Amino acid sequence: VRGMNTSSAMSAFERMEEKVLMQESRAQALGELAGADLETQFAQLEGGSDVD
Amino acid sequence: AQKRSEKQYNDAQNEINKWQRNAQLALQKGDENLARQALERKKTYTDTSAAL
């Protein structure tokens, strides 16, 4: 309940931080790829194709 | 080396054509940003082709 440093609580904070940062890092890596026009073009093409 | 440049020049023309298709698609889609990216891409390629 306290959230004070503990054998279980301490481990949980670090792991959660790692999960948050790793996901953010992946997103950061992803956004650069996302920024390029070709990636955007594929999504637009797919939507038209999907509707058909 | 001359053949490689010619292939690169051919690739640039091919690349422009691929970009052109996206631009045509963009107009149908109505998204201004997709069209803009193709034009910028076309210009650098043209300069490279001229230099080549």
Helices B2-29 + A37-51 axis angle, to 10:
50
User: How far off is chain A from B3, nearest CA to CA, in Å?
Assistant: 27
User: How far off is chain A from B50, nearest CA to CA, in Å?
Assistant: 23
One-letter amino acid of A18: E
Residue B17: list chain A partners with CB under 8 A: none
Pick the closest to residue B45 from B17, B13, B4 (CA basis): B13
Judge: A44–B31 Cβ closer than 8 Å, yes or no: yes
Report the Cα A4 to chain-centroid distance in Å.
28
DSSP H helical segments within chain A, as ranges?
A: 9-35, 37-51
User: How far off is chain B from A25, nearest CA to CA, in Å?
Assistant: 26
Q: What is the DSSP letter of A3?
A: -
Distance (Å, whole) CA A45 – CA A47: 6
Q: Which residues are within 8 A (CB) of B1 and not within 5 positions of it... i.e. 6 or more apart?
A: none
Q: Which residues are within 8 A (CB) of A14 and not within 5 positions of it... i.e. 6 or more apart?
A: none
Distance (Å, whole) CA A37 – CA B33: 9
Elucidation technique: cryo-EM
Q: Using alpha carbons, list the distances in angstroms from residue A9 to A21, B3, B31.
A: 19, 65, 49
Instruction: Name the token pair of A25.
Output: 């890092």
CB contact A29 to B (< 8 Å): no
